[PDB]
């Protein structure tokens, strides 16, 4: 009953994943569950009956929601994410079809002329292409996408980590609102321009809320996760002396994969327990909360082979970097597509890349970087 073991200060976390993974596999710390192997995570994943990601209260404020009635309620916490059928199926049905391969191959040329403009700018003395390049890629291509049309791109890059960062929070709207209440006023300003997606939530049976939530949902949650892909794909094909090969060897799909794989832009995610549940040897409560750590569970030498080297090439590589089950990554082939193109581009571009400086993302849940500064030759 209650137990303890912790990532200590000599160790770093994937050595502590890898002893989790060999020792404790389901764990109880006391206050939660956290699950390190791949075969309990892709249990609780899968098993959406048991293990709900009804973890906000949307399922129990559903009615105080579509009858109206709440009003300063923080919106991220109504949306498809944090939801369990069959709430869950109608909300994602309403665009599950928007990420279509027809719809993506018609903006390959848009993404990839963007890419170039964005490589355009990049000083090869010295430059930060988190900055030039990470960023600014995904926020134009999801404004595009949704017809949303995006005026200062920092503004927006400000109101997209205000609202990732803190997503789920039980509180009040007004928490922030300096720059928050500015990002609400900017889309209903902005809810007529939309494509057809928009449109089929704004004109439909949820709340206000909900339709805020939804449409902030889709704008604004991929933004980070593309960004940290891409900064990720680049220093990991860097760190291990893989663009050459990369190039030669066309495996930028495979590649882009590995870090997936390899370098999880997010970590870990949660579920709530429903019932008493069987997890391995372990017995879960009726109401306990599991964590459960991607990152862990894309190292397991169960499912990959030499599971802590990067292989470019690795096949096949059944990653759970988006997520498995029904709630599996609605954008993971739009940011496949777009850090593909990135990387593709890139490389075409620049030779000799050398890393000068690095600052990361602070927070163990998300994986990528805030600064990353290097050296281009070009030819
Ligand atoms: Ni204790």
Same mark, same amino acid.
């Given at each position: ?190 809810? *007529? ?9 704004? *004109? ?176």
């Amino acid at each position: 009953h209650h137990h303890h073991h912790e990532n200590l200060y000599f160790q770093s976390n994937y050595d502590w994943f890898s002893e989790m993974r060999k020792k404790d596999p389901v764990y109880y710390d006391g206050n939660i569950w956290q699950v390190f192997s791949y075969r309990y995570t892709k249990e609780v994943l899968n098993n959406f009956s048991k293990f709900s990601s009804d973890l906000t209260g949307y399922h129990e404020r559903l009615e105080d929601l579509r009858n109206g009635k709440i009003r300063f309620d923080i919106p991220t916490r109504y949306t498809m994410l944090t939801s369990d059928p069959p709430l869950h199926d109608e909300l994602r049905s309403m665009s599950a079809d928007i990420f279509s391969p027809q719809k993506l191959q018609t903006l390959e040329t848009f993404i990839r002329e963007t890419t170039r403009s964005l490589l355009d700018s990049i000083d090869p003395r010295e430059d930060d292409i988190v900055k030039k390049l990470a960023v600014p890629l995904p926020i134009i291509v999801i404004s595009k996408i949704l017809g949303l049309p995006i005026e200062d791109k920092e503004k927006f890059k400000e109101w997209s980590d205000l609202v990732a960062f803190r997503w789920g929070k039980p509180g009040e709207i007004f928490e922030l609102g300096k720059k928050y209440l500015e990002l609400i006023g900017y889309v209903k300003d902005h809810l *007529n321009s939309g494509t057809e997606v928009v449109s089929r939530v704004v *004109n439909s049976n949820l709340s206000d809320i909900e339709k805020l939530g939804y449409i902030i949902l889709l704008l604004i949650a991929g933004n980070e996760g593309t960004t940290n892909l891409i900064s990720n794909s680049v220093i990991d094909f860097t760190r291990f002396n893989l663009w050459q090969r990369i190039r030669e060897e066309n495996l930028y799909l495979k590649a882009i994969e590995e870090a997936l794989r390899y370098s999880p832009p997010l970590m870990r995610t949660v579920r709530k327990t429903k019932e008493r549940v069987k997890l391995g040897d372990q017995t879960i409560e009726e109401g306990e909360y599991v964590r459960v750590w991607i990152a862990s569970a894309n190292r397991d030498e169960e499912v990959f082979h030499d599971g802590e080297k990067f292989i470019p090439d690795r096949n096949p590589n059944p990653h759970l970097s988006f997520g498995s089950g029904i709630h599996l990554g609605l954008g993971a082939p739009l940011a496949r597509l777009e850090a593909r193109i990135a990387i593709e581009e890139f490389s075409k571009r620049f030779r000799h890349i050398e890393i000068l400086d690095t600052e990361k993302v602070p927070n163990e849940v998300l994986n990528g970087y805030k600064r990353l500064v290097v050296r281009l030759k070009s030819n």
